[PDB]
């Protein structure tokens, strides 16, 4: 829609937890302001949730919640989402 793009720092993280565990914790990430569930799929009990914060230091802080959560058995966050310039990979 016309010109309108501007962001600070945010990426998509794939939280891996028991099939019904993620529904409890994963759905919670969508309730938070910074963290937000982008893609909700039950392929193996893992959902995609993006989180934004002042900088990476605060962004990684959120992972401590999903990683420390027992329901979460694994965590694969690989996706940079920010409007400003290009110089990385998918």
């Amino acid at each position: 829609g016309s010109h309108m793009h501007t962001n600070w720092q945010v990426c998509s993280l794939v939280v891996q937890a028991k099939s019904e565990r993620i529904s409890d914790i994963s759905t919670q990430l969508n309730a938070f302001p910074g963290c937000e569930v982008a893609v909700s799929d039950a392929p193996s009990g893992q959902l995609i949730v993006v989180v934004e914060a002042e900088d990476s230091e605060t962004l990684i802080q959120t992972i401590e919640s999903v990683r420390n959560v027992e329901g979460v058995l694994a965590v694969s966050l690989v996706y940079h989402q920010q409007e400003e310039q290009g110089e990385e990979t998918p």
Partner: protein
């Protein structure tokens, strides 16, 4: 609420979350159309 991007981001996020986390292929398959 102010939600205006999860639709465009989910398109690219799934591309890096599906081919990496073996997630589903929402925009990584339907390609029979070009233009």
């Amino acid at each position: 609420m102010k939600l205006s991007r999860r639709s465009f981001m989910k398109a690219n996020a799934v591309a890096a979350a599906a081919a990496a986390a073996g997630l589903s292929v929402p925009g990584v398959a339907r390609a029979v159309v070009g233009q």
